[PDB]
Structure formats: C-alpha cells, structure tokens
Amino acid sequence: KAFDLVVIGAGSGGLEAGWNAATLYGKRVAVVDVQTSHGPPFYAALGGTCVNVGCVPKKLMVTGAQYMDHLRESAGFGWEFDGSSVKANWKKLIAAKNEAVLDINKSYEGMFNDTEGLDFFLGWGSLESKNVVVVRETADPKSAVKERLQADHILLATGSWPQMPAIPGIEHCISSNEAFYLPEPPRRVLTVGGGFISVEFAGIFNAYKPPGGKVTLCYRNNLILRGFDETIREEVTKQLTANGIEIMTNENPAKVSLNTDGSKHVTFESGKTLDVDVVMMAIGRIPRTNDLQLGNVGVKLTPKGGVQVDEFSRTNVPNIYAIGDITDRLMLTPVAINEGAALVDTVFGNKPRKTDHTRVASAVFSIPPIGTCGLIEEVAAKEFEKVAVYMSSFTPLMHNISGSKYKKFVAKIVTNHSDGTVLGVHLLGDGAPEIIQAVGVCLRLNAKISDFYNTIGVHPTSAEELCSMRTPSYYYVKGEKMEKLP
Amino acid sequence: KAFDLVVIGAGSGGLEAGWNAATLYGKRVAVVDVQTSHGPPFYAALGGTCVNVGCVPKKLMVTGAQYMDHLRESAGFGWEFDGSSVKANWKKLIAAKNEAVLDINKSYEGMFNDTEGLDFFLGWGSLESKNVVVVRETADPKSAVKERLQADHILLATGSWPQMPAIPGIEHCISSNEAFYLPEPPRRVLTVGGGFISVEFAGIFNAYKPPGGKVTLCYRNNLILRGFDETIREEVTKQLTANGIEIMTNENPAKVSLNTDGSKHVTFESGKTLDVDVVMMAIGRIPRTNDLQLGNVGVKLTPKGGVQVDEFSRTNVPNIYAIGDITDRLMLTPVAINEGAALVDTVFGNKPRKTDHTRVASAVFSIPPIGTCGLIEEVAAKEFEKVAVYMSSFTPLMHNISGSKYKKFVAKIVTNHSDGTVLGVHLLGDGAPEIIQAVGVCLRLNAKISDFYNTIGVHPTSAEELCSMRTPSYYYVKGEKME
Ligand SMILES: Cc1cc2nc3c(=O)[nH]c(=O)nc-3n(C[C@H](O)[C@H](O)[C@H](O)COP(=O)(O)OP(=O)(O)OC[C@H]3O[C@@H](n4cnc5c(N)ncnc54)[C@H](O)[C@@H]3O)c2cc1C
Ligand SMILES: Cc1cc2nc3c(=O)[nH]c(=O)nc-3n(C[C@H](O)[C@H](O)[C@H](O)COP(=O)(O)OP(=O)(O)OC[C@H]3O[C@@H](n4cnc5c(N)ncnc54)[C@H](O)[C@@H]3O)c2cc1C
Ligand SMILES: O=C(NCCc1ccc(F)cc1)c1ccco1
Ligand SMILES: O=C(NCCc1ccc(F)cc1)c1ccco1
Ligand SMILES: [Br-]
Ligand SMILES: [Mg+2]
Ligand SMILES: [Mg+2]
C-alpha cells in the first residue's frame, strides 16, 4: 500500500516513468488506470491514449487508407485489375486494428505481472492528501474506495480528452474516440477542426467511404494546420482537395439536428447546412484534471486548465509531478515518454535531466504526410535578425507515372542566416515522417545548412533533396520577408 | 576548337563537373557522349548510366514491383478486389520508364542548347595527346574523326560497364543494360550475383513474371550482399525467399547452351542445371578505359583497368583528371557528382577539395529496402578495441495486419564504445533509404549514440527505433564478439 511512486494514468508518460523507476532504480511503483484494454466506455486504458485511441490505431488506419492511392497508382506501373470489383471493407480494418491494440494491452499486462514492485491498480485515481492516492470505482469522488496508496512521490499522467463544443446537438456528434469503433464507414462525414486529428481522419474516411461518399473537413479560420509551415499548410490543403476531400475554411458548426433517417443536419455560423452520417469533432484536446480532485491538495493549473509545472515536471506541491498531455504543452507520446524518463532519472536516479521541448520531430499522417522539426520561418524571423529559407518543391518522378501529379514533395530548411545554424526542417510527401527523425538528431548536434549540403546524397530518394540546397530561396531580415539581403 | 575543359562522358560526374566549370567558373566547356538518348546500342547516353540504365529506371521499376506486395497486403486492411483479374503489364512499365528516361535525355539536350560555354559533341572520346581529345564515329580508333578538341584540361568520366564472365555461352546471357529493354517479362530468370543489381532486378522480375513464373538468384559465396550488415544480409535472404525468389548460394554458372525452344540451359559449377528464359549477369562493373586510348598520353591505370587518381582526382598527367566509376572507388552517382564538383573547385576555384568516401549513405532497393551509412561491425571491430552494437529487430505492426509477417525491420547502430561515436547505421525495412539520408549528416557531425537516444522520437515510425536504443545488444572487444 506504501509506494515510492504512485502514477495516475498507465499511458505513454506514466508507464515510461513507472517501468524506469521499478527496473532502473529498484523502486516500488503503483500505476492506476480505469481500464485494462481499449474501447468503450473509457476508450483509453493500460498503454494510454496513443496505444488505445491515438497514434497506433490511427497509423494502422491511415496505412489502410493509403491502399486507395496504391491501387489507383499501380495502373501507371502496368498493374491491371477490375477497378469495378474494388471495395474498402471498413469492418475488416476495425477488427484488425482492435486485435493489434488488444495484443498491446495484453503486452503491458505481462509487463506489470513479470516486473517486481510494479503493480497495476484498476480504477480512478484522485488526490486525498499530498502523499495519498485514493483509487475509486468511478470518476465520482462519492464512489467506493478500491484502494488507499501512500506515496513518497505522486505522478499525474492522466493525459487529455477531446473538447466537444457546447452547441445544440453535440450529443449527435462524435470524437476521435468513437471514430475508432464506428460499425460502418460513413458515406458523408464532417471532420471539425484544422489540426492533425481532423486531417488524419478525413484521409481515413475518404479511403473507406461507400460509393457516392463525400468527406468534408471544416476549420473555423482560413488555413488548416496552424503551427505547421505555411507552404506545407497550403500544399496539404490542395493535395487533400485533389483526393476528393472538400475543405470548408472560415466555417464552424452552429448546431446539429438528427433528421428522421438517423442522419445529421449540420447548421454552420455562415448559415450553410450539410447532411452527413457522421460529425467528428476534433477541435482540441484538454487536460484530464477534473477527476483528480486537485483542489484537495492545492495543485495549480494554468489559465488553459493544464497542470502548471517547472522544467523538472514539478507542481507547486513537493513530491507531486506532472508529465504528458495533462501539462497542456506539446501533446505528443515521445514528449510524454521523455518527460517520464527525465523525472525518474532526476528524482530516483539523482541525475537531474530536463526534457528539451525545442527541435522535436513530429509528423501528420495526412496523405501524403508531413514531417517537421524545429521553428517555422515566421517564428524564427521574430527571434533572429537574419533568417534564410531554403526550399525545393518537385513532382516525384514516380507520381508523374502514378497519375498523382498533385503529390508535390516540399522540403524547407529555415536557418539562422548569421551562422547557417538549422532552425527548422519541414517536409511534405511520402516518407516525410521517416526522413525527419534523423533530422531531429542533426538539430540537437547544431547542424548548419553546410553540414546538410556537404553530406553526400542517397540517390534516388526524396531525402537527398535536404543535402542539395545551398542557396536561400528568400530571407526574413528583422522580421521582413525579401528575395535578397541588403 | 579550343576548350578550358573537355569532359569524356556526359554522366553523373561529367555533367556536374562541366556544368560547374561553365556556369560557376565561367570556363568554356566541351562534353562528349556516344548517344543523346537511352537504350540500344550503347545503353548509357547523355545523362550517364544512372539516368539511362541505372538508379532512375531501376527505382521506377522497383516502385512498380512494390505493387505486387501492396495489392496482396491491402487485403489485411480490408481491401477486396478480383485477385484473378490481376496482371503485371511489364510492357506498360517499360514504356512508362522509357518516357521518363527520354524526358531526362531531352532536358539535358535543352541544358546544352541553353547553357552558353557548354558544348555537347556526339561520338567516342579518346586521348590523341595531353591537350587534344578526338571524337570518332565508333569505339574503334580507326573510325572516322568527327571532332578534334584542344583542351587546357581533360576530365575522364566514362563510368563503368557490366563484367561478363568468359564462360561457354556468355553470348546467350545479358547484363542490367539489356534487362531494362526486355520486350516481355521472363517467366524464368536467373540473376547471377549477390550485389545490389542482382538483388534489385530479382525483385523487379519477381513482381512482373507471368503466371507459374520463377526468379532464381545465384551467388558464388555463402550469403548475398557482401559489404552490407550481416544481420541485414541474412534477413534480406529470408525476405526474398518468402516472396518466392530461389536464392542459390555457393553456386556459379559454368556454362550456358540454348535448349531447342531457345530457352537457356544453365550448367552450374556444382553440376546442377536450370532452364530459364533469361540469364542476367550482375557479377561486377569495371571502369570504361579501353576506348580512351590512354596509352597515347601515358595516364596510369591499375591492373583492374581503373584510372589511378590521388585524393583530388588527379591522374599522373597534369591537366588530366578522372572522377566517377572510372576511378573504381565508390560506384554511386552522388559520389561521382561530389568528385566532379570537388575537382572543378580544385582546378578552376583554387579552393582545393577532396571527396570523403567514408560515411556515405547508400541504399539497396530490395523489397523491403536497405539504408546504410558507415562501417559494419566486423570492419569496425578490426579497427577499434571496443565496439558496441545496438540492435532492434521486429515484425512492424502493419505487417501483422498485412500478412507479410516475414518483413522484419532491422535497425543497428555500430559505435566506438570507448567514446560512443557512431561508426555505422544499418537499416532494413520500408523507408530505410529515406531514414538513412539525415543519418549521413549525423555521422559527418560525429554523432554519438547519446545524440541518438537523447533525440525525441517521431511516433509512430520505423526511424524512432534509432532514438530508442540506450543499451548495447552485444560488443566486440579486441576483434572478439561478447555477448
Ligand atoms: C487521435 C489521436 C492521434 C494521435 N496521434 C499521435 C501520433 O501520431 N504521435 C504522437 O506522438 N502523439 C499522438 N497523439 C497524442 C498521444 O496519444 C498523447 O500525446 C499521449 O498519449 C499522451 O501521453 P500521456 O502520458 O500524457 O497520457 P495518455 O497516453 O493519454 O495516458 C493517460 C491515461 O490516464 C488514464 N486516466 C485518466 N484519468 C485517470 C484517473 N483518474 N485514474 C486513472 N487513470 C486515469 C487513461 O485511462 C489513460 O490511459 C494522438 C492523440 C490522439 C487523440
Ligand atoms: C543497374 C544500375 C543501378 C544503379 N543504381 C544506383 C543507385 O540506385 N544509386 C546510385 O547512387 N548509383 C547507382 N548506380 C551507379 C551509378 O549509375 C554510377 O555510379 C554513376 O552513373 C557513375 O557516374 P559517372 O560520372 O562515373 O559515369 P556514368 O554516369 O556511367 O557516365 C559515363 C558516360 O560516359 C559515356 N561514355 C563511355 N565511354 C565514352 C567514350 N569513349 N566517349 C564518350 N562518352 C563515353 C557513357 O555513354 C555514359 O553516358 C547504378 C548502376 C547500375 C548499372
Ligand atoms: O522523384 C523524385 N524524387 C524522389 C526520389 C526519386 C525517385 C525516382 C527517380 F527516378 C528519381 C528520384 C524527383 C523528381 C524530381 C527530383 O526528384
Ligand atoms: O510497427 C512498428 N513500428 C513502426 C511504426 C509503427 C507503425 C504502426 C503502428 F501501429 C505502430 C508503430 C513496431 C512494431 C513493434 C514495435 O514497433
Ligand atoms: Br559470404
Ligand atoms: Mg509486478
Ligand atoms: Mg551550349
């Protein structure tokens, strides 16, 4: 019942911190989660949001969606078959994803069982006192107490949860959570949001829609994928349009009414309507703080609801730490994992280490995908006196033959033009996410543009474009865009 | 006429060097090649071997071959279509590849038209004297003179050429050159060699073979792809086999006869026999120096037939240089290109630079592919007292759904364990050629394993394996392997 470390949330950050504390430093660890395997009612479970209803099933389902392109594209390479016989069996895809996620759920069960002093507790974790975690049967603080856990240290790792805009008929709409378990592929679907989740799902629904199907993505502002490279944002918009996805920008649902056939009548603020079989809200995720009862030990949130932390993942309350999506910064699995490993290496390993939230490689499994690391040029141009942008757009030779001539590969390097230091790298095209990983290592090593251009290309690849760019396309000088320096 | 630079060979290295001398150093430049567009009779042409009958066409063809896997694998993700309707039309592939190669040919034509001080001459370059290149009708030095080109400086950039073993029936066999122009996909093909070309073509033929077809690869030694990571060699052997390619190791063709139907009868040294429609020899590539009449100016060759060069690509004759495969160092287009740029910067720039032939990222477009940069462990182990190998190997999740459970991804980092400096990175699996590029940049920056495992992963990717390896899988200590 006494534990060196109690962790609330057996997710990306929580398990990393948990398993490290146990196996690296022979410490004694409890991990609390509300569910041992994926799906309704709580969706997330043992393994966390990424494993159960995030990166893992998303990537398998985007891989599924990619065959719509491959099947078409194969004809340019001389592949012949009956196109009229091609059907996308959504039910098969979901069953396969379910089995893959369950095998991972069972994998972590093994991990807890085998591993000495690493114990899983089933239920809802909340804070009683600065050193006591109560495990309840339900999210209600009023529900029965399964356990009382004494803690030299408490780790909040409860992640995030979709935000549902409080509009009339929001009970007719779904989140990403429900998208993973639709029994049928929607013929018509509105994905609401211009972020990666809305974009990724629009690709998935687009590939698996029955005949006469239509995918509509709406975004409240003018250009999807805020925080990504602007060239890439414009290109992805075109490429999703080229693949039959309708992009409604400067548009936002006012309310939803169930028609009598079970379909959804969506009324926008502009006053436009659309009938769809599914409205998927992906407008934001917010930190899961409510159910922890933080007001019972005084842990400060930020003005955005996220648990306030210093660089070492420490709350105001000694011995209470917070990592991952609950901190409401970068909502990424490998950042959660990094924070967890750093916290345990600091607190239990006596090797203080802080997560670097700069120069983090990330991706959007849009079709085709984004891979990015470091600063977009607008952000750079505000911090550096002289910023150079190197840029190479090319229709990849295979996509001339494939018939997908809209699939332009985009490679941008943003540098500090004063010393040539690479500030950011932004890729759109097949392989972008794979290419960008080792770019992350390059940025950690303080790579200059000349370290890129002096490295010998691997040919033929899209990646070699990164080692072929010696001349800036344009510059920002004291925040001002211009073709040439004075 | 009189030129600052004459380049013999309008290929990867030759075009880089000539474009740079003309456009960057404002030199007057002549370039010579035997053909303006791809294919028979001389196969290479304006653009070089890579453009015409190497990297470019082979990658388009491997891309085509990849759909055999995609169509099958789609079914795990719920794609359904009439499998019995499925045909691999090799004719369309070849037609698509030809148009793509010809457009490159044409654009190089336009480059020569449009670039002032850069002249193309059609036909066969050879050295008359130390400042005179002669262009002739044919490879034969008795052939009619087309041009005589006075040159301050001469660059030899004629590349390499398939090696054919002098065996009975060699005339019934082809190289990669002819393979790019087969009118029909062979039902039965023997690829001869364990190198990237035999392996890459084995995959290409395997996807486009007509029903009840079979691809056989034979290799003299025990394990294909010498010079590659040993784990990767054994896995690529397994994964080729699992896709229905017959790997015959410790086997070499003794001779070839025609059966009555004109198929080829393969007599292996082991006595063994194989009946095939095509025998593709991919056993080596040798420098193309025979036709250059290098005796006329006494340019030093190796017994092999390569042009001997220092680190700056200088022959023993001042004002004459060799870059690319003709030097027989690293036979890769970007190395040829790098050598070409570095030479022009040395001669005309007085900015002396040598190509670094170490830590060069390269790929094999096997299915699945290889990406590699720097030393394999057995090499590293002979040079360094303590060598760490970090290894990650698994069936990627999507290949449990796809059915291709045989497709193990392999990521291995080799380090000097005394300081953690990365000596080599070896990848097998989808994306490997794309992952390894930026790894090349890392090794140029002397990355250590700590720089890899302190870098935050992109998830979910294969590449993040490179940033998840904290602890050696095993070591070499004074050349000895230690679990
Ligand atoms: C659709 C989608 C796609 C994504 N794709 C990617 C991607 O491709 N790459 C990427 O890097 N990131 C991706 N993410 C983000 C990623 O899932 C999160 O950043 C990551 O899971 C955060 O980890 P964490 O440790 O913060 O918590 P989580 O991994 O979310 O784990 C939190 C856990 O806490 C549990 N929990 C909550 N409250 C309690 C309680 N009171 N008591 C007990 N247990 C509790 C939940 O059951 C859950 O299992 C995606 C997210 C979503 C929603
Ligand atoms: C099947 C195959 C696949 C390959 N795949 C890859 C790959 O994926 N990646 C990679 O990096 N490398 C690859 N290579 C290697 C790559 O093509 C070579 O390393 C590169 O083309 C060599 O460049 P170079 O400048 O040395 O010569 P080349 O590009 O070969 O240029 C030589 C040129 O000289 C011409 N020529 C020859 N003799 C004469 C003469 N006497 N007068 C005038 N012109 C002459 C030829 O017609 C030719 O155009 C491949 C090679 C082959 C054969
Ligand atoms: O396709 C291209 N790049 C991807 C790699 C590749 C594939 C196939 C190739 F033949 C040659 C390169 C491309 C088009 C213009 C410049 O690069
Ligand atoms: O597949 C794997 N890795 C590639 C990236 C990925 C793709 C899709 C996924 F669902 C999950 C990860 C893998 C299997 C075991 C460990 O890594
Ligand atoms: Br061997
Ligand atoms: Mg245990
Ligand atoms: Mg000209």
Coordinates of N, CA and C in Angstrom, one line a residue, chain B residues 323-450:
Chain B
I323 N 37.2 11.2 -62.5 CA 36.2 11.1 -61.4 C 35.2 10.0 -61.8
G324 N 34.4 9.6 -60.8 CA 33.3 8.6 -61.0 C 33.8 7.2 -61.0
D325 N 33.0 6.3 -61.5 CA 33.2 4.8 -61.5 C 34.5 4.5 -62.2
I326 N 35.0 5.3 -63.2 CA 36.3 5.1 -63.9 C 37.4 5.0 -63.0
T327 N 37.3 5.6 -61.8 CA 38.3 5.6 -60.7 C 38.2 4.4 -59.9
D328 N 37.1 3.6 -60.0 CA 36.8 2.4 -59.3 C 36.9 2.5 -57.8
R329 N 36.5 3.6 -57.2 CA 36.5 3.7 -55.7 C 35.1 3.4 -55.2
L330 N 34.2 4.3 -55.2 CA 32.7 4.1 -54.8 C 31.8 4.4 -56.0
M331 N 31.2 3.3 -56.5 CA 30.4 3.5 -57.8 C 28.9 3.9 -57.4
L332 N 28.8 5.1 -57.1 CA 27.5 5.8 -56.7 C 27.4 7.2 -57.4
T333 N 26.3 7.5 -57.9 CA 26.0 8.8 -58.6 C 26.4 10.0 -57.7
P334 N 26.0 10.1 -56.5 CA 26.3 11.2 -55.7 C 27.8 11.3 -55.3
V335 N 28.5 10.2 -55.3 CA 29.9 10.2 -55.1 C 30.6 10.8 -56.4
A336 N 30.2 10.2 -57.5 CA 30.6 10.7 -58.9 C 30.4 12.2 -58.9
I337 N 29.2 12.7 -58.6 CA 28.8 14.1 -58.6 C 29.7 14.9 -57.6
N338 N 29.9 14.4 -56.4 CA 30.7 15.1 -55.4 C 32.2 15.2 -56.0
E339 N 32.7 14.1 -56.5 CA 34.1 14.1 -57.0 C 34.2 15.2 -58.1
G340 N 33.2 15.3 -59.0 CA 33.2 16.2 -60.1 C 33.2 17.7 -59.6
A341 N 32.3 18.0 -58.7 CA 32.3 19.4 -58.1 C 33.6 19.7 -57.5
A342 N 34.2 18.8 -56.6 CA 35.4 19.0 -55.8 C 36.6 19.2 -56.8
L343 N 36.6 18.5 -57.9 CA 37.7 18.6 -58.9 C 37.7 20.1 -59.5
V344 N 36.5 20.5 -60.0 CA 36.3 21.8 -60.6 C 36.7 22.9 -59.6
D345 N 36.3 22.7 -58.4 CA 36.6 23.7 -57.3 C 38.1 23.7 -57.1
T346 N 38.8 22.6 -57.2 CA 40.3 22.4 -57.0 C 41.0 23.2 -58.2
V347 N 40.7 22.8 -59.4 CA 41.4 23.3 -60.6 C 41.1 24.8 -60.8
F348 N 39.8 25.1 -61.1 CA 39.3 26.4 -61.5 C 39.0 27.3 -60.3
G349 N 38.8 26.8 -59.2 CA 38.4 27.6 -58.0 C 39.6 28.1 -57.1
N350 N 40.8 27.4 -57.3 CA 41.9 27.4 -56.3 C 41.2 27.3 -54.8
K351 N 40.2 26.5 -54.7 CA 39.5 26.1 -53.5 C 39.6 24.6 -53.4
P352 N 40.8 24.1 -53.0 CA 41.1 22.7 -53.2 C 40.2 21.8 -52.3
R353 N 39.5 20.9 -52.8 CA 38.6 20.0 -52.0 C 38.7 18.6 -52.5
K354 N 38.7 17.6 -51.6 CA 38.6 16.2 -51.9 C 37.3 15.6 -51.3
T355 N 36.7 14.7 -52.1 CA 35.5 13.9 -51.7 C 35.9 13.0 -50.5
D356 N 35.1 13.0 -49.5 CA 35.2 12.0 -48.4 C 34.3 10.8 -48.8
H357 N 35.0 9.6 -49.0 CA 34.4 8.3 -49.4 C 34.0 7.5 -48.2
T358 N 34.3 8.1 -47.0 CA 33.8 7.4 -45.7 C 32.4 8.0 -45.4
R359 N 31.6 7.2 -44.7 CA 30.3 7.6 -44.1 C 29.4 8.1 -45.2
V360 N 29.4 7.4 -46.3 CA 28.5 7.7 -47.4 C 27.2 6.8 -47.2
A361 N 26.1 7.5 -47.0 CA 24.8 6.9 -47.0 C 24.5 6.3 -48.4
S362 N 24.0 5.1 -48.5 CA 23.7 4.3 -49.7 C 22.5 3.5 -49.4
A363 N 21.9 2.9 -50.4 CA 20.6 2.1 -50.3 C 20.7 0.9 -51.3
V364 N 19.9 -0.1 -50.9 CA 19.6 -1.2 -51.9 C 18.1 -1.2 -52.0
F365 N 17.6 -1.1 -53.2 CA 16.1 -1.1 -53.4 C 15.6 -2.5 -53.6
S366 N 16.0 -3.3 -52.6 CA 15.4 -4.6 -52.4 C 14.0 -4.4 -51.9
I367 N 13.2 -5.4 -51.7 CA 11.8 -5.4 -51.2 C 11.9 -6.4 -50.0
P368 N 11.9 -5.9 -48.7 CA 12.0 -4.4 -48.4 C 13.4 -3.9 -48.6
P369 N 13.6 -2.6 -48.7 CA 14.9 -2.0 -49.0 C 15.9 -1.9 -47.8
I370 N 17.2 -1.6 -48.1 CA 18.3 -1.3 -47.2 C 18.7 0.2 -47.2
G371 N 19.0 0.7 -46.1 CA 19.7 2.0 -46.0 C 20.8 1.8 -45.1
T372 N 22.0 2.3 -45.4 CA 23.3 2.1 -44.6 C 24.1 3.3 -44.7
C373 N 24.9 3.6 -43.7 CA 26.0 4.7 -43.7 C 27.0 4.2 -42.7
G374 N 28.3 4.2 -43.1 CA 29.5 3.9 -42.3 C 29.7 2.4 -42.2
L375 N 30.4 2.0 -41.1 CA 31.1 0.7 -41.0 C 30.1 -0.4 -40.5
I376 N 30.2 -1.6 -41.1 CA 29.6 -2.8 -40.5 C 30.5 -3.2 -39.3
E377 N 30.0 -4.0 -38.4 CA 30.6 -4.3 -37.1 C 32.0 -5.0 -37.3
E378 N 32.0 -6.0 -38.1 CA 33.2 -6.9 -38.4 C 34.3 -6.0 -38.8
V379 N 34.0 -4.9 -39.6 CA 35.0 -3.9 -40.1 C 35.5 -3.1 -38.8
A380 N 34.5 -2.5 -38.2 CA 34.7 -1.6 -37.0 C 35.5 -2.3 -36.0
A381 N 35.3 -3.6 -35.8 CA 35.9 -4.5 -34.7 C 37.4 -4.7 -34.9
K382 N 37.8 -4.7 -36.2 CA 39.3 -4.9 -36.5 C 40.0 -3.6 -36.2
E383 N 39.3 -2.4 -36.3 CA 40.0 -1.1 -36.2 C 39.9 -0.5 -34.8
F384 N 38.8 -0.9 -34.0 CA 38.6 -0.3 -32.7 C 38.6 -1.4 -31.6
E385 N 39.1 -1.1 -30.5 CA 39.4 -2.1 -29.3 C 38.0 -2.5 -28.8
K386 N 37.1 -1.6 -28.6 CA 35.7 -1.8 -28.0 C 34.7 -1.3 -29.0
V387 N 33.8 -2.2 -29.5 CA 32.7 -1.8 -30.5 C 31.4 -2.3 -29.8
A388 N 30.5 -1.4 -29.7 CA 29.1 -1.6 -29.2 C 28.2 -1.8 -30.5
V389 N 27.3 -2.8 -30.5 CA 26.2 -2.9 -31.5 C 24.9 -2.7 -30.8
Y390 N 24.1 -1.7 -31.1 CA 22.7 -1.5 -30.6 C 21.8 -2.1 -31.7
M391 N 21.0 -3.0 -31.4 CA 20.1 -3.7 -32.4 C 18.7 -3.7 -32.0
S392 N 17.8 -3.4 -32.9 CA 16.3 -3.5 -32.8 C 15.8 -4.3 -34.0
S393 N 15.0 -5.3 -33.8 CA 14.5 -6.2 -34.8 C 13.1 -6.6 -34.4
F394 N 12.1 -6.5 -35.3 CA 10.7 -6.9 -35.0 C 9.9 -6.8 -36.3
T395 N 8.9 -7.7 -36.5 CA 7.8 -7.5 -37.5 C 7.1 -6.2 -37.1
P396 N 7.1 -5.2 -38.0 CA 6.3 -4.0 -37.7 C 4.8 -4.3 -37.7
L397 N 4.1 -3.6 -36.9 CA 2.7 -3.8 -36.6 C 1.9 -4.0 -37.9
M398 N 2.0 -3.1 -38.8 CA 1.2 -3.1 -40.1 C 1.4 -4.4 -40.9
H399 N 2.6 -5.1 -40.7 CA 2.9 -6.4 -41.4 C 2.3 -7.6 -40.7
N400 N 1.9 -7.5 -39.4 CA 1.0 -8.4 -38.7 C -0.4 -8.3 -39.3
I401 N -0.9 -7.1 -39.6 CA -2.2 -7.0 -40.3 C -2.1 -7.4 -41.8
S402 N -1.0 -6.9 -42.5 CA -0.9 -7.1 -44.0 C -0.8 -8.6 -44.3
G403 N -0.2 -9.4 -43.5 CA 0.1 -10.8 -43.8 C 1.6 -11.0 -44.0
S404 N 2.4 -10.0 -44.3 CA 3.8 -10.1 -44.6 C 4.6 -10.1 -43.2
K405 N 4.3 -11.2 -42.4 CA 4.9 -11.3 -41.0 C 6.4 -11.6 -41.1
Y406 N 6.9 -11.9 -42.3 CA 8.3 -12.2 -42.6 C 9.1 -10.9 -42.7
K407 N 8.4 -9.8 -42.8 CA 9.1 -8.5 -43.1 C 9.6 -7.9 -41.8
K408 N 10.7 -8.4 -41.2 CA 11.3 -7.9 -40.0 C 12.1 -6.6 -40.4
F409 N 11.7 -5.5 -39.7 CA 12.6 -4.3 -39.8 C 13.8 -4.5 -38.9
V410 N 15.0 -4.1 -39.4 CA 16.3 -4.2 -38.6 C 16.9 -2.8 -38.6
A411 N 17.2 -2.3 -37.4 CA 18.0 -1.1 -37.2 C 19.1 -1.5 -36.3
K412 N 20.4 -1.2 -36.8 CA 21.6 -1.5 -36.0 C 22.4 -0.2 -36.0
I413 N 22.9 0.2 -34.9 CA 23.9 1.3 -34.7 C 25.2 0.6 -34.2
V414 N 26.3 0.8 -34.9 CA 27.7 0.3 -34.5 C 28.4 1.6 -33.9
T415 N 29.0 1.5 -32.8 CA 29.7 2.6 -32.1 C 31.1 2.2 -31.7
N416 N 32.0 3.1 -31.7 CA 33.3 3.0 -30.9 C 32.9 3.2 -29.5
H417 N 32.8 2.2 -28.7 CA 32.2 2.1 -27.3 C 33.1 2.9 -26.3
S418 N 34.4 3.1 -26.6 CA 35.3 4.0 -25.8 C 34.7 5.4 -25.6
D419 N 34.1 5.9 -26.7 CA 33.5 7.3 -26.6 C 32.1 7.4 -27.2
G420 N 31.5 6.3 -27.7 CA 30.1 6.3 -28.1 C 29.9 6.8 -29.5
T421 N 31.0 7.2 -30.2 CA 30.9 7.8 -31.6 C 30.3 6.7 -32.5
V422 N 29.3 7.1 -33.3 CA 28.6 6.2 -34.3 C 29.5 6.0 -35.5
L423 N 29.9 4.8 -35.7 CA 30.8 4.3 -36.9 C 29.9 3.9 -38.1
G424 N 28.7 3.3 -37.8 CA 27.8 2.8 -38.8 C 26.4 2.7 -38.4
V425 N 25.5 2.8 -39.3 CA 24.0 2.6 -39.1 C 23.5 1.8 -40.3
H426 N 22.7 0.8 -40.0 CA 22.3 -0.2 -41.0 C 20.8 -0.5 -40.8
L427 N 20.0 -0.2 -41.8 CA 18.6 -0.4 -41.8 C 18.1 -1.3 -42.8
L428 N 17.2 -2.2 -42.5 CA 16.4 -2.9 -43.5 C 14.9 -2.7 -43.1
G429 N 14.1 -2.4 -44.1 CA 12.6 -2.3 -44.0 C 12.1 -1.1 -44.7
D430 N 10.8 -1.0 -44.9 CA 10.2 0.1 -45.7 C 10.7 1.5 -45.1
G431 N 11.2 2.4 -46.0 CA 11.6 3.7 -45.7 C 13.1 3.8 -45.4
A432 N 13.8 2.7 -45.3 CA 15.2 2.6 -44.9 C 16.1 3.6 -45.7
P433 N 16.0 3.7 -47.1 CA 16.7 4.7 -47.8 C 16.5 6.1 -47.5
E434 N 15.3 6.5 -47.1 CA 14.8 7.8 -46.7 C 15.2 8.1 -45.3
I435 N 15.2 7.2 -44.4 CA 15.7 7.3 -43.0 C 17.2 7.6 -42.9
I436 N 18.0 6.9 -43.8 CA 19.4 6.9 -43.6 C 20.1 8.3 -44.1
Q437 N 19.4 9.0 -45.0 CA 19.9 10.3 -45.5 C 20.4 11.2 -44.4
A438 N 19.5 11.6 -43.5 CA 19.8 12.5 -42.4 C 20.8 11.9 -41.4
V439 N 20.9 10.5 -41.4 CA 21.9 9.8 -40.6 C 23.3 10.1 -41.1
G440 N 23.4 10.2 -42.5 CA 24.6 10.6 -43.1 C 25.1 11.9 -42.5
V441 N 24.2 12.9 -42.3 CA 24.6 14.2 -41.8 C 25.1 14.1 -40.4
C442 N 24.4 13.2 -39.6 CA 24.7 12.9 -38.2 C 26.2 12.4 -38.0
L443 N 26.6 11.5 -38.9 CA 27.9 10.8 -38.9 C 29.0 11.8 -39.3
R444 N 28.6 12.8 -40.2 CA 29.5 13.9 -40.5 C 29.7 14.8 -39.3
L445 N 28.7 14.9 -38.5 CA 28.8 15.8 -37.2 C 29.4 14.9 -36.0
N446 N 29.9 13.7 -36.3 CA 30.5 12.8 -35.3 C 29.4 12.5 -34.2
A447 N 28.2 12.3 -34.6 CA 27.1 11.9 -33.6 C 27.6 10.7 -32.8
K448 N 27.2 10.7 -31.5 CA 27.4 9.6 -30.6 C 26.0 8.9 -30.4
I449 N 26.0 7.8 -29.7 CA 24.7 7.0 -29.5 C 23.8 7.9 -28.6
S450 N 24.5 8.6 -27.6 CA 23.7 9.5 -26.7 C 23.0 10.6 -27.5

